[PDB]
Amino acid sequence: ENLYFQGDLIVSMRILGKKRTKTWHKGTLIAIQTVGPGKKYKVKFDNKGKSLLSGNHIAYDYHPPADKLYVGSRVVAKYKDGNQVWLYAGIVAETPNVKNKLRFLIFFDDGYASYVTQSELYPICRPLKKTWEDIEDISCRDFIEEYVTAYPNRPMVLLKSGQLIKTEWEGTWWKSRVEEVDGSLVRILFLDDKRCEWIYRGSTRLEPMFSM
């Protein structure tokens, strides 16, 4: 059937939708279709064509109220890629508190992690019951499921600037150094490559967590 209303969604609303590039972009909701128990959402993008999307691949174009966000909530967030910025999907790992300076910790679908503000987040419209189950990468999916279900039990390694450790990249262990700690994240310098990455302090990419 063709619908005009579904839950709190209305045809003609402005929305964010997931493109095939896996980045999210502004558009208009132009149709809502049912087939038995299933629902699809037709979006016309501003600088593009059209897609027919599942409800977990559209997001509201406003910032979620804080009382609506939990550990495990499915969100789109500001993602830094060199000097460019995109909107990319993730899971809320921490809500604002004193130890994190009142920020949200995000675990992105590709395995990166970052702290963001409320003004950098958007809520996915129709998340799955197990919110992690639409994460395509299997290693990322299983790690996030374990994290969200074990929370608040969160093993982490205690690290200090200048400490030498081994860190994983592309299947092998690399000599590295702790440059800085910011709440639950550590900035690691890969010593051969002379470039850095922010990594979650409970990540199994840190050799002391791999061991456990």
Ligand SMILES: CS(=O)(=O)Nc1ccc(Cl)cc1
């Ligand atoms: C969720 S996170 O710690 O930022 N990244 C991550 C992703 C995948 C694995 Cl197997 C381990 C860690």
